[PDB]
Amino acid sequence: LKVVAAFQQSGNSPMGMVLDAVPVIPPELRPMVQLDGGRFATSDLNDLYRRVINRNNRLKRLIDLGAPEIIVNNEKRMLQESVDALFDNGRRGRPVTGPGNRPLKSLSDLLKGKQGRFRQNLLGKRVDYSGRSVIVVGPQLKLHQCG
């Protein structure tokens, strides 16, 4: 009754709980850099999106021929798990790992954890017009003075 009351209060709908369109984050948040000597580096999310688009075009072509349903629930199931690993790796079953058998960074990985909202914003950072050095005594000065 809490959550039925919650849909009951606001002018929302439960339509968004299922989806028929998946948004895409801007590319500079998954930027791709080449070093000197032709050394390329980028984000992990991109090939995950590639799994998404390959399954959507794969299903998308496969429907038009027609098929037995064994193929159909297979491809749709792979699609659903691709969405799931896109949002959060490791929640359902085995986590998606790549090279080195180490897990990748999903959307929640950018949000949750030791890169969180403290750890992005409230962690604090370095700025310019600053410096540091060692200190000694200035015993001839005044309070308002410093050296």
């Binding site: 948004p23 000197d36 000597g37 959307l107 914003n121 604090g124 370095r126 310019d128 600053s130 540091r132």
Partner: protein, 1109 residues
């Protein structure tokens, strides 16, 4: 004293020392020694027992060879590990930046099983890294050090815990092998037992025994007295050997129909197959040693009998019935007791040969695992042993090991002491060891078993206390991998010279005597009542009847660098930890005068350090140089000796070497011919002798502030040497190649006239910051320009080129001359990694004066920084007018408890002054015992006191009673050790006498260019817009959290809006506020932090209608 070229140094040793100090590198030299298995190792580990010594490589061979296929139709064997010669000397390898290695041969053999075949083939197994006589290793020219890793020894660990519900006594044991599963014999809170192997919920004891193939009768016969397990035989609830062993296999998987395999043979694959369940060779010996087994045996195996299992069953139940002793049929009786966790007999040391032994073991574990696979799929009769061996993953495992390990570190070469103390070092953490945050503060502290073996003093001050130990003086390594300690053994009040290496385990049973003992001329005690320690470690006081064993010496709890610290017994151990840790961070000077007062360590230290020229062969000197010494051996031949001149450290200090002797001297093997670093006359020196004052003065010694005198900077007595290196290459890009040349884009010629014909600068140029080092230039591509600049280029009539002006320049706050020029090239046969055409290196050295704020300290943990560099005249000075050097503050004395500096102040002024005691008729009682022949001193003297047997207090007052003056009859220093001094500022004498004197001080490495950082505008990140900070970057200043909380506590919010926006992340504001500062216009309003909006886009990525109103 057993040193050929030793200078005299007078000591206060009341005792003697029957046994000399052993060789200090023997912890590392004799460890190496063994995987090779030297002939020196053969006799060395052959005269001290050691019946059948086997090689370290052999130890992996005979367990590895023979190699057998699954078909049983062919076989492969290994034999004869040996080694070839070196390929390059150390100066070449360090020079030409390679590994210091030597080839490796092992003669293998393929043997057919169907008919027998003799395919014997000595195969080059690969290159193999080698240890110097310095005990070192050279990887890519870098000198790196292997750290000793402390681990618990495998074996039987008995323990008793008490629960808190019903407060009764459960008795467990955890028995761990090497490289296998575990098993635990526990006691329940109720009845009875805890016998789950590899953590499978529980087992009963009887089904292990009956399913082991034994009657229920012999459970009563052998184990019925021992009546709590009669309840196990009651509630065993299954009769039948296999009828319960099927339920055992149900405890294994669960849920699988068992066969005759999984009845006994699978169980004997966990405990009677020695191919995957293999406890340690010492753990074997530990099982025998604890359990009172057949121990007079030369045996070697890793097989687990079940008779030991029923033995620890019955030992366990005799423990939890309440007893004291136990014997076993067929073996030695055992006193029943619980075990200790952090006892040294439970915690051994993997040495480097055990480390490298494990790395060769895993290297063949990864190497052979395709070789037996290719025993099938390779063609029969067409295989040579060469076709089956891949030598590649072995050397991949070696170079894999020396890289990326926290057990391989750089040599700290900035102090010969520091390089010594990086060795002999005991580490707890590591691979195969504990986790740093996930290990509690109980393994950290010391236990009374730590005595005599590991000094508790030397540890780093930070988050490593209890993690880094330091090995003591007279320790020695057990071939099993433990600490052995010599002790003097006394029979009936007669102390023998019978030196017996002993471990702590047998020490528990025995009686350890006292070092400072009233011993009368034979080994006989004056007193009958002696302090002693039990196995608990409690200090008990006993009559002189039980004592079998005696200490060899004082200072047995003392490490090496600890032992160079006089008057330890009068100050705090915490301060001792501080300044003891500080002495490794000393810097070399250019003069190296010996310290006025020390101990018997420093001369004994550097001779094992190996930075100083030790005479190899007793001969005579023929001819020296500034750079080499050609000796004349007494039998024929000669030898030259090239000393190293101004070699760069890992930290940039000076490694120059210099001769100390003449051209015609009859020298002996072992003697000093020339010294290098901080040493002088055979012994270390961390600074100079200086004249000290103990008054507080004008706030310039305000709470450990330190001041100086003007003479020292002008007499250059604290001058330092610092060599900084720069390095850049010429490479290839996708468009083309990088270029090193004299041709530059648009530039002055004043910045060119000090450069050579082909780019780089010439020998002996003095740079300032921003000057150009190497002329480097790359192509641009083909871009377009603004029409306005293209207009100006037509106005000035000069197109530049299609290239980029990206040359090598010097970083900031840096000066000095360039000495060496090193330069490589790909077309000139030089091995260097790919994509690169050409390489260059630069060596920049600089004399640096001492200035303010640098880190200064004395040996007693006192320290501080330089506030003010005075003139020479505003200074305290004597009645004879001699100016003082430094002045120290009063209040470092009481609360930090550091009076040893006062002790060596009095003794030091006694040394500079000199005495001649006037007891021509009768010796005073202070000097009535100590040595004789000492009651004079020619001033500027050379003296020493050992650690615990040095001077005593009335003696210290006694030496002040003779006061040989400088020129005239002048007692400047009274019988209370103070002087009357004048104002160096206004002139009048002071109304109180002041403690003054001499003290030996030192200088460390925290110069002011090192920790200075400053930036207005520089580079930024590419991920975020934040400033980036590293070495060649200006650095950036990390602003925290509580800082912002205090900014809220002021409520100065416009400052915060300045800080987190225009200084951190918004790019488009930085141009605005910077340009406003340029024009001197108004400060613009801080716009929206765009880094904030990035979060909003992340929310919009995840099905969120977020919105602002």
């Amino acid at each position: 004293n057993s040193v050929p070229g030793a200078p005299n140094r007078v000591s206060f040793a009341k005792l003697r020392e029957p046994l000399e100090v052993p060789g200090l590198l023997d912890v590392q030299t004799d460890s190496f020694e063994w995987l090779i298995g030297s002939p020196r190792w053969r006799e060395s580990a052959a005269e001290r027992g050691d019946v059948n010594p086997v090689g370290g490589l052999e130890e992996v061979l005979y367990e590895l060879s023979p190699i057998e296929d699954f078909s049983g139709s062919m076989s492969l064997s290994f034999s004869d590990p040996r080694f070839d010669d070196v390929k390059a000397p150390v100066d070449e390898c360090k020079d030409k930046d390679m590994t210091y290695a030597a080839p490796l041969f092992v003669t293998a053999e393929f043997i057919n099983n169907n008919t027998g075949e003799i395919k014997s083939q000595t195969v080059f197994m690969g290159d193999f890294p080698m240890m110097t006589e310095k005990g070192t290793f050279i990887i890519n020219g870098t000198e790196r050090v292997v750290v000793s890793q402390l681990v618990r020894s495998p074996g039987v660990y008995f323990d008793e815990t008490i629960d808190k519900s019903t407060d009764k006594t459960l008795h467990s044991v955890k028995v761990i092998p090497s490289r296998g599963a575990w098993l635990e014999f526990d006691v329940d809170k109720r009845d009875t037992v805890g016998v789950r192997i590899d953590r499978k919920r529980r087992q009963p004891v009887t089904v292990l025994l009956k399913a082991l193939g034994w009657t229920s009768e012999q459970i009563v016969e052998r184990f019925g007295f021992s009546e709590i397990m009669r309840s196990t035989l009651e509630k065993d609830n299954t009769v039948g050997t296999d009828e319960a062993l099927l339920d055992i296999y149900r405890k294994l998987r669960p849920g699988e129909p068992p066969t005759k395999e999984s009845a006994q043979t699978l169980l004997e694959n966990l405990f009677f197959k020695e191919k995957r369940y293999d406890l340690a060779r010492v753990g074997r010996y530990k099982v025998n040693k604890k359990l009172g087994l057949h121990v007079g045996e030369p045996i070697t195996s890793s097989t687990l009998t079940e008779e030991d299992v029923v033995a620890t069953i019955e030992y366990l139940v005799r423990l939890h019935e309440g007893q004291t002793t136990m014997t076993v049929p067929g073996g030695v009786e055992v006193p029943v007791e619980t075990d200790d966790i952090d006892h040294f007999g439970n915690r051994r040391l993997r040495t480097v040969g055990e480390l490298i032994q494990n790395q060769i073991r895993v290297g063949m574990s990864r190497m052979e695992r395709v070789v037996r696979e290719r025993m099938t799929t390779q063609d029969v009769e067409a295989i040579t042993p060469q076709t089956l061996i891949n030598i590649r993953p072995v050397v991949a495992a070696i170079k894999e090991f020396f890289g990326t390990s926290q057990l391989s570190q750089f040599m700290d070469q900035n102090n010969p002491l520091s390089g010594l103390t990086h060795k002999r070092r005991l580490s707890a953490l590591g691979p195969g060891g504990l986790s740093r945050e996930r290990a509690g503060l109980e393994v950290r502290d010391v236990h009374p078993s730590h005595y005599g073996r590991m000094c508790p003093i030397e540890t780093p001050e930070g988050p490593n206390i209890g993690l880094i130990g330091s090995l003591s003086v007279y320790a020695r390594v057990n071939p099993f991998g433990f600490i052995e300690t010599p002790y003097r053994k006394v029979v009936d009040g007669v102390v023998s010279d019978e030196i017996v290496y002993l471990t702590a385990d047998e020490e528990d049973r025995h009686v350890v005597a006292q070092a400072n003992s009233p011993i009368d001329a034979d080994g006989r005690f004056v007193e009958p009542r002696v302090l002693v320690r039990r196995k608990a470690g409690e200090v008990e006081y006993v009559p002189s009847s039980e004592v079998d064993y005696m200490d060899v010496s004082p200072r047995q709890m003392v490490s090496v660098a600890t032992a160079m610290i006089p008057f330890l017994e009068h100050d705090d151990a915490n301060r001792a930890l501080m300044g003891a840790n500080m002495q490794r961070q000393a810097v070399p000077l250019v003069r190296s005068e010996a310290p006025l007062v020390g101990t018997g360590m420093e001369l004994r230290a550097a001779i094992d350090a190996g930075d100083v020229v030790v005479a190899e062969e007793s001969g005579v000197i023929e001819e020296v140089s500034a750079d080499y010494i050609t000796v004349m051996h007494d039998n024929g031949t000669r030898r030259t000796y090239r000393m190293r001149k101004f070699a760069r450290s890992n930290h940039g200090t000076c490694a120059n070497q210099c001769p100390i002797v003449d051209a015609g001297d009859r020298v002996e093997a072992g003697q000093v011919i020339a010294d290098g670093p901080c040493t002088d006359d055979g012994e270390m020196a961390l600074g100079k002798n200086l004249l000290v004052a103990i008054m507080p003065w004008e706030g310039h010694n305000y709470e450990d502030a330190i001041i100086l005198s003007n003479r020292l900077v002008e007499e250059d007595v604290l001058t330092s040497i610092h060599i900084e290196e720069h390095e850049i290459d010429a490479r290839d890009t996708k468009l083309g190649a990088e270029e090193i040349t004299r041709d530059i884009p648009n530039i002055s010629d004043e910045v060119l006239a000090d450069l050579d014909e082909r780019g780089i600068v010439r020998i002996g140029a003095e740079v300032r910051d921003g000057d150009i080092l190497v002329g480097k230039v790359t192509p641009k591509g083909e871009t377009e320009l603004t029409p306005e600049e293209r207009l100006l280029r037509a106005i000035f009539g000069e197109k530049a080129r299609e290239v980029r002006d990206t040359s090598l320049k010097v970083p900031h706050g840096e000066s000095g001359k360039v000495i060496g020029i090193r330069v490589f090239s790909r077309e000139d046969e030089d091995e260097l990694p790919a994509g690169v055409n050409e390489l260059v290196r630069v060596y920049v050295a600089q004399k640096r004066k001492i200035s303010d704020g640098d880190k200064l300290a004395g040996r007693h943990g006192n320290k501080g920084v330089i506030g003010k560099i005075l003139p020479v005249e505003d200074m305290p000075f004597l009645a004879d007018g001699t100016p003082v050097d430094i002045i120290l503050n009063t209040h470092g004395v009481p609360r930090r408890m550091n009076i040893g500096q006062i002790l060596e102040t009095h003794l030091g002024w006694c040394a500079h002054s000199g005495w001649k005691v006037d007891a021509a008729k009768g010796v005073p009682d202070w000097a009535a015992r100590l040595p004789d022949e000492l009651l004079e001193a020619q001033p500027n003297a050379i003296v020493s006191t050992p650690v615990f047997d040095g001077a005593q207090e009335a003696e210290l007052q006694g030496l002040l009673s003779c006061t040989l003056p400088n020129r005239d009859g002048d007692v400047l220093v009274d019988a209370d050790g103070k002087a009357m001094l004048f104002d160096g500022r206004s002139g009048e004498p002071f109304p109180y006498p002041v403690t003054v004197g001499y003290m030996y001080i030192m200088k460390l490495h925290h110069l002011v260019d090192d920790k200075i950082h400053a930036r207005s505008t520089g580079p930024y990140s590419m991920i975020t817009q934040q400033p980036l900070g590293g070495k060649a970057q200006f650095g950036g200043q990390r602003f925290g959290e509580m800082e912002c909380w205090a900014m809220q506590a002021y409520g100065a919010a416009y400052t915060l809006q300045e800080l987190l926006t225009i200084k951190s992340d918004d790019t488009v504001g930085r141009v605005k506020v910077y340009e406003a500062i340029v024009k001197g216009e108004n400060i613009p309003e801080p716009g929206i932090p765009e880094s904030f909006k990035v979060l909003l886009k992340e929310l919009q990525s995840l099905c969120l209608n977020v919105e602002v109103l």
